[PDB]
Design a protein around this ligand. Structure first.
Ligand code: HEM
Ligand SMILES: Oc1c(Cl)cc(Cl)cc1Cl
Ligand SMILES: Oc1c(Cl)cc(Cl)cc1Cl
Length: 137
């Protein structure tokens, strides 16, 4: 289920984070244009840039912290606050997050594995709603 999925992801976090972020960028090419250093790069080119590995790992670590702290796929209000607050996220609407989760759920459904895709969909929906409550437009 959802808690096991967190362990599955954590066990090979950089690999999952990279493949899921690539799925996002590839499904939603306009979102790539917000990452200047990743424009004009193939999947294998990104996987060799240090900030790409590092940044994906740090994003997914935080995502997994938020997932682990959630109750029944509902994140903590305080976690939503952090995500709205972060300087890094001053550009963003909740649409950006919705898209990430669509890509994540699709990746999970396509993978060989017994991810609880439905729970990740609900978690994403609940995170988006918590981001609105914490003030993201
Ligand atoms: C639950 C979802 C997400 C989490 C946990 C998360 C977390 C983070 C973290 C920890 C960083 C800092 C990375 C670093 O400095 O090494 C970051 C940076 C960033 N995030 Fe997110 N993020 C999420 C969703 C999104 C989405 C959907 C977008 C855009 C579509 C986005 C855009 C960015 C951008 C542009 C930065 C730039 C940091 C910089 O280099 O200045 N994030 N995010
Ligand atoms: O920074 C991101 C990562 Cl590492 C993965 C996904 Cl799915 C989306 C974003 Cl916006
Ligand atoms: O370099 C980044 C990566 Cl690969 C993922 C995200 Cl979400 C943000 C940044 Cl700044």
């Amino acid at each position: 289920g959802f808690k096991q999925d967190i362990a599955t992801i954590r066990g090979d976090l950089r690999t999952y984070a990279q493949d899921i972020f690539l799925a996002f960028l590839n499904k939603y090419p306009d979102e790539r244009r917000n990452f200047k250093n990743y424009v004009g790069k193939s999947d294998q080119e990104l996987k060799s840039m240090a900030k790409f590995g590092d940044h994906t790992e740090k994003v997914f670590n935080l995502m997994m912290e938020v997932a682990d702290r959630a109750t029944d796929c509902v994140p903590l209000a305080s976690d939503a606050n952090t995500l709205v607050q972060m300087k890094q996220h001053s550009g963003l609407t909740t649409g950006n997050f919705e898209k990430l989760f669509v890509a994540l759920v699709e990746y999970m459904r396509a993978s060989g594995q017994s991810f609880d895709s439905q729970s990740w969909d609900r978690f994403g929906k609940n995170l988006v709603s918590a981001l609105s409550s914490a003030g993201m437009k």
